[PDB]
Amino acid sequence: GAIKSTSEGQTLILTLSNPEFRNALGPEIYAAGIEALNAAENNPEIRSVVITGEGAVFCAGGNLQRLQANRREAPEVQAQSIEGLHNWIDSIRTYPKPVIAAVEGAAAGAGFSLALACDFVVAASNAVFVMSYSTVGLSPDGGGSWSLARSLPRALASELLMGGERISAQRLHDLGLVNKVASAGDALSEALRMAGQLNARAPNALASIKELINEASSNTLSQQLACERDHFVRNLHHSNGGEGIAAFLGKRTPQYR
Amino acid sequence: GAIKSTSEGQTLILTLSNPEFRNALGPEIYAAGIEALNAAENNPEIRSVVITGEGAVFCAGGNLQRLQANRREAPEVQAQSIEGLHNWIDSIRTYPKPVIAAVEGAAAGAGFSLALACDFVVAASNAVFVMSYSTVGLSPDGGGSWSLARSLPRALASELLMGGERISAQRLHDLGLVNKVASAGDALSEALRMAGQLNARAPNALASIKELINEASSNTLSQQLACERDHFVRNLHHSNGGEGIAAFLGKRTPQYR
Amino acid sequence: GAIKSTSEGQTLILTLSNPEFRNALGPEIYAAGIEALNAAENNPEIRSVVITGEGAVFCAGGNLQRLQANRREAPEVQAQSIEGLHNWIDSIRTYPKPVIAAVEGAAAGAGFSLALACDFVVAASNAVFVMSYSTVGLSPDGGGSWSLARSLPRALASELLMGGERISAQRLHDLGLVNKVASAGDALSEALRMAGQLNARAPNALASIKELINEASSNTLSQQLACERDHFVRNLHHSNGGEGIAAFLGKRTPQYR
């Protein structure tokens, strides 16, 4: 399997491609995705990232034949395959630019976990989100247990994770796990629209905001208020802070670096 | 008061019985409920638990006459009564099998707390969920403050806990605190349906999943990703992992131990 | 700018007044608001607090001209302005009485953060809630990043904080961030209604409840169960505990001190 990188304006598009296995994740997808993030990281022609599946599907999870094979191997082989995924996930989560998932058809198992790791999600109204791990005797990975257990109450998180129950794009939207529910086939275009609006915001302010959102889950309010203070003062004194305020006061469009 | 244990297939049914006091909780209910969990824990004929109230009511809370009496006693008497409840709650929360609440009529005070401690809830559409403690000059117990404060935002958690305001089964369902809203009188049957679908899943994978959901509230993502990795590798190498994958690839029904 | 204090029955009303700047927050509003809380704190004629904006607006955030000026000053000037706000916010959050926000028109930037710091919110159906910081090149303050990151899932919290996207009173209500959506111009009256119902509850029990809700975000369940036990026993033995139970058993209205 592979990741294909393209660009439209200031947004990197990463396309998961494994047509025979419905864009299944695997050790080479993890390394190419880490690489594509690393290449774009300090490149100012890129201000946001969209992750999307080639064709009619986002990602159906891992490849069940490869898992069945790693079962003949020592445990460390699978542990190592998971560390690659988990590095991908961490790298998305700490990326200093917004990452957006654009989901057509299925986002299943680690596909769903991947979509949950991004900052935003756009899903076709007929997208199928499911933690399929349970259904084949497994527990989740890609941080799917964390993302759902911490975002949702017990009952529903249990249904999704233990039950392996499908949930709709519309219902995810109503809970706040999906941003925008698009027409079948329009998820990528809608994601590029949303990414364009983010591309117009100040890069340092977005980086700061994402960092705050990350730290909130482990800070008390008091600790967060101190972090917020330091970020705020810094961003105000940054040139973008001056451009942002002056542009609003002048009724013009801010031009950020 | 008492708990009555019965079985239907692979699900234990615990029926709270205190007809004169609308299935009020109390020190003997706590001990019989701990016992019934302990007896079923390593018994493989039981793969899930349903907790339900006898008759038209789930549980209206504690018994107000007993509380009024313990007020004549040293504080330690009530503290000891609470430790029994709190052990019940902990024991549900750490039970390695899914526990499901089936709520007809009222789930009030510690009844509501109890329903929140379970992994799943099924509620009749005319069920009355309420943190009644406030209304009689008290603060909550059974973990109701935790379950609501961590699952809901400030405003609503405050309304429920400070206001003592009733909330509907439908509204709980919309927030993700209730799984299924059933017709009046059908809550138990619906819970047994849901429990049957869980009974078909792999016991070790469900145990692992519940453990992950528990640990998520106190882990960072990084810590959770490591836990997820260890559970995943273990469950893959488990015989159930092989049966689960092989059954799916073969389009047959997995048979788990 | 200023805060105007008035009373109706047992509820203090704090009115944010800065008509030229749409009730913008600033160092003198922070000190007068801290003072008004301190004065009312051990005064039993006050049992709840409503915070509201003078006129058709709640609070549009900070004053952009003052920020633009503090940009000429050393960083410490703005850091000090933020510490005043952050003390206000902390003081609301730890106040032993319920604080309710009554939002007409805009609650923007630190206005939205302020509304999120209160225990309850009542919003006119045409109220505009927005984290505007992003839009002028800034990151948030007043605990807005914490309040949203911990109450909502990633996608939606990102949209609100990074996107600077407006969200409706109705949608906040559906998520549990707003308690009551009122007719335009009725937000304050509805807040006083809700505050009246809180005024009838036992002060010590409400104080305890708010303290529990605060501590839940940093406790495990086990730690919370111990806190709940101690609060419960204390509140039962309190005279209000006896009045609360006796009043309910007697079908009369409890009279609390």
Side-chain angles (χ1 to χ4, degrees), chain B residues 241-256:
Chain B
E243 168 70 2
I245 311 326
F248 182 93
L249 289 169
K251 294 165 181 61
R252 55 175 192 83
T253 307
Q255 307 298 299
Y256 302 118

Side-chain angles (χ1 to χ4, degrees), chain A:
Chain A
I3 285 181
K4 309 177 176 187
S5 301
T6 51
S7 258
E8 301 189 6
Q10 291 158 306
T11 105
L12 186 63
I13 303 182
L14 308 186
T15 297
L16 323 174
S17 181
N18 194 337
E20 316 289 291
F21 293 92
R22 312 198 288 141
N23 304 329
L25 299 174
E28 18 277 313
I29 278 167
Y30 310 148
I34 284 152
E35 166 48 29
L37 296 181
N38 290 335
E41 186 159 344
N42 293 123
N43 176 356
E45 307 180 323
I46 304 303
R47 282 179 182 193
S48 61
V49 183
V50 172
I51 293 176
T52 205
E54 192 177 67
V57 163
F58 182 72
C59 166
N63 182 131
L64 286 183
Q65 278 153 53
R66 277 67 222 168
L67 288 164
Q68 185 165 247
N70 297 348
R71 223 176 153 261
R72 299 164 217 158
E73 298 300 340
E76 292 71 16
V77 170
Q78 188 62 51
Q80 291 268 37
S81 171
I82 305 309
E83 299 278 24
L85 174 63
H86 280 5
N87 289 325
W88 186 205
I89 291 302
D90 173 63
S91 151
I92 292 163
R93 180 41 73 238
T94 62
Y95 206 54
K97 305 173 173 178
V99 183
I100 302 176
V103 174
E104 297 284 353
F112 191 7
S113 296
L114 177 67
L116 296 159
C118 296
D119 305 303
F120 302 79
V121 179
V122 179
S125 51
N126 66 334
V128 177
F129 290 94
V130 67
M131 294 290 180
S132 52
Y133 299 99
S134 250
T135 297
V136 295
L138 310 170
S139 51
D141 71 355
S145 70
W146 203 81
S147 307
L148 299 174
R150 307 281 299 233
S151 293
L152 297 170
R154 171 56 60 141
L156 188 56
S158 283
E159 176 183 338
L160 296 179
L161 297 161
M162 285 185 230
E165 275 296 276
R166 293 115 228 100
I167 184 161
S168 73
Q170 190 51 65
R171 170 72 168 150
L172 290 174
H173 178 270
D174 290 347
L175 300 155
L177 282 157
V178 166
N179 297 101
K180 224 347 192 112
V181 171
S183 283
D186 285 313
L188 177 50
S189 305
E190 281 302 309
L192 297 163
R193 197 98 58 109
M194 171 170 313
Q197 293 180 120
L198 297 169
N199 292 350
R201 330 291 275 190
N204 54 304
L206 296 193
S208 270
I209 294 338
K210 183 164 165 165
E211 194 183 316
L212 289 167
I213 296 177
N214 293 336
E215 300 224 41
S217 51
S218 63
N219 273 340
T220 62
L221 182 54
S222 296
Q223 300 178 141
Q224 199 84 352
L225 292 168
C227 286
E228 291 186 353
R229 183 198 58 223
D230 295 335
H231 285 277
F232 189 104
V233 163
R234 201 183 311 118
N235 288 325
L236 166 67
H237 286 269
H238 202 271
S239 58
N240 293 154
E243 168 70 2
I245 311 326
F248 182 93
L249 289 169
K251 294 165 181 61
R252 55 175 192 83
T253 307
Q255 307 298 299
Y256 302 118
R257 75 174 75 124

Side-chain angles (χ1 to χ4, degrees), chain B residues 190-249:
Chain B
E190 281 302 309
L192 297 163
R193 197 98 58 109
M194 171 170 313
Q197 293 180 120
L198 297 169
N199 292 350
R201 330 291 275 190
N204 54 304
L206 296 193
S208 270
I209 294 338
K210 183 164 165 165
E211 194 182 316
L212 289 167
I213 296 177
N214 293 336
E215 300 224 41
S217 51
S218 63
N219 273 340
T220 62
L221 182 54
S222 296
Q223 300 178 141
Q224 199 84 352
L225 292 168
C227 286
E228 291 186 353
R229 183 198 58 223
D230 295 335
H231 285 277
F232 189 104
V233 163
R234 201 183 311 118
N235 288 325
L236 166 67
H237 286 269
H238 202 271
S239 58
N240 293 154
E243 168 70 2
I245 311 326
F248 182 93
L249 289 169

Side-chain angles (χ1 to χ4, degrees), chain B:
Chain B
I3 285 181
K4 309 177 176 187
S5 301
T6 51
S7 258
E8 301 189 6
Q10 291 158 306
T11 105
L12 186 63
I13 303 182
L14 308 186
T15 297
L16 323 174
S17 181
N18 195 337
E20 316 289 291
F21 293 92
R22 312 198 288 141
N23 304 329
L25 299 174
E28 18 277 313
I29 278 167
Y30 310 148
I34 284 152
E35 166 48 29
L37 296 181
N38 290 335
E41 186 159 344
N42 293 123
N43 176 356
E45 307 180 323
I46 304 303
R47 282 180 182 193
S48 61
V49 183
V50 172
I51 293 176
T52 205
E54 192 177 67
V57 163
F58 182 72
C59 166
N63 182 131
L64 286 183
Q65 278 153 53
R66 277 67 222 168
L67 288 165
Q68 185 165 247
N70 297 348
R71 223 176 153 261
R72 299 164 217 158
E73 298 300 340
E76 292 71 16
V77 170
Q78 188 62 51
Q80 291 268 37
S81 171
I82 305 309
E83 299 278 24
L85 174 63
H86 280 5
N87 289 325
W88 186 205
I89 291 302
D90 173 63
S91 151
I92 292 163
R93 180 41 73 238
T94 62
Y95 206 54
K97 305 173 173 178
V99 183
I100 302 176
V103 174
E104 297 284 353
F112 191 7
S113 296
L114 177 67
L116 296 159
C118 296
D119 305 303
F120 302 79
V121 179
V122 179
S125 51
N126 66 334
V128 177
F129 290 94
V130 67
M131 294 290 180
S132 52
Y133 299 99
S134 250
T135 297
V136 296
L138 310 170
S139 51
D141 71 355
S145 70
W146 203 81
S147 307
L148 299 174
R150 307 281 299 233
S151 293
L152 297 170
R154 171 56 60 141
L156 188 56
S158 283
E159 176 184 338
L160 296 179
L161 297 161
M162 285 185 230
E165 275 296 276
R166 293 115 228 100
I167 184 161
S168 73
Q170 190 51 65
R171 170 72 168 150
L172 290 173
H173 178 270
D174 290 347
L175 300 155
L177 282 157
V178 166
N179 297 101
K180 224 347 192 112
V181 171
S183 283
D186 285 313
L188 177 50
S189 305
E190 281 302 309
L192 297 163
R193 197 98 58 109
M194 171 170 313
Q197 293 180 120
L198 297 169
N199 292 350
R201 330 291 275 190
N204 54 304
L206 296 193
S208 270
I209 294 338
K210 183 164 165 165
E211 194 182 316
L212 289 167
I213 296 177
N214 293 336
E215 300 224 41
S217 51
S218 63
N219 273 340
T220 62
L221 182 54
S222 296
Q223 300 178 141
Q224 199 84 352
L225 292 168
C227 286
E228 291 186 353
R229 183 198 58 223
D230 295 335
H231 285 277
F232 189 104
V233 163
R234 201 183 311 118
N235 288 325
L236 166 67
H237 286 269
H238 202 271
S239 58
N240 293 154
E243 168 70 2
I245 311 326
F248 182 93
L249 289 169
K251 294 165 181 61
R252 55 175 192 83
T253 307
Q255 307 298 299
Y256 302 118
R257 75 174 75 124

Side-chain angles (χ1 to χ4, degrees), chain C:
Chain C
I3 285 181
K4 309 177 176 187
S5 301
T6 51
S7 258
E8 301 189 6
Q10 291 158 306
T11 105
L12 186 63
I13 303 182
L14 308 186
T15 297
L16 323 174
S17 181
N18 195 337
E20 316 289 291
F21 293 92
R22 312 198 288 141
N23 304 329
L25 299 174
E28 18 277 313
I29 278 167
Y30 310 148
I34 284 152
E35 166 48 29
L37 296 181
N38 290 335
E41 186 159 344
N42 293 123
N43 176 356
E45 307 180 323
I46 304 303
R47 282 180 182 193
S48 61
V49 183
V50 172
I51 293 176
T52 205
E54 192 177 67
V57 163
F58 182 72
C59 166
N63 182 131
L64 286 183
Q65 278 153 53
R66 277 67 222 168
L67 288 164
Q68 185 165 247
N70 297 348
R71 223 176 153 261
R72 299 164 217 158
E73 298 300 340
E76 292 71 16
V77 170
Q78 188 62 51
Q80 291 268 37
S81 171
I82 305 309
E83 299 278 24
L85 174 63
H86 280 5
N87 289 325
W88 186 205
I89 291 302
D90 173 63
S91 151
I92 292 163
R93 180 41 73 238
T94 62
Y95 206 54
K97 305 173 173 178
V99 183
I100 302 176
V103 174
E104 297 284 353
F112 191 7
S113 296
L114 177 67
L116 296 159
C118 296
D119 305 303
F120 302 79
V121 179
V122 179
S125 51
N126 66 334
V128 177
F129 290 94
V130 67
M131 294 290 180
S132 52
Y133 299 99
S134 250
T135 297
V136 296
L138 310 170
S139 51
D141 71 355
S145 70
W146 203 81
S147 307
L148 299 174
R150 307 281 299 233
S151 293
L152 297 170
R154 171 56 60 141
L156 188 56
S158 283
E159 176 184 338
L160 296 179
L161 297 161
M162 285 185 230
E165 275 296 276
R166 293 115 228 100
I167 184 161
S168 73
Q170 190 51 65
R171 170 72 168 150
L172 290 173
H173 178 270
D174 290 347
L175 300 155
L177 282 157
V178 166
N179 297 101
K180 224 347 192 112
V181 171
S183 283
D186 285 313
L188 177 50
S189 305
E190 281 302 309
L192 297 163
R193 197 98 58 109
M194 171 170 313
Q197 293 180 120
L198 297 169
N199 292 350
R201 330 291 275 190
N204 54 304
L206 296 193
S208 270
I209 294 338
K210 183 164 165 165
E211 194 182 316
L212 289 167
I213 296 177
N214 293 336
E215 300 224 41
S217 51
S218 63
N219 273 340
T220 62
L221 182 54
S222 296
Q223 300 178 141
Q224 199 84 352
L225 292 168
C227 286
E228 291 186 353
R229 183 198 58 223
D230 295 335
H231 285 277
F232 189 104
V233 163
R234 201 183 311 118
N235 288 325
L236 166 67
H237 286 269
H238 202 271
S239 58
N240 293 154
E243 168 70 2
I245 311 326
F248 182 93
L249 289 169
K251 294 165 181 61
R252 55 175 192 83
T253 307
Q255 307 298 299
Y256 302 118
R257 75 174 75 124

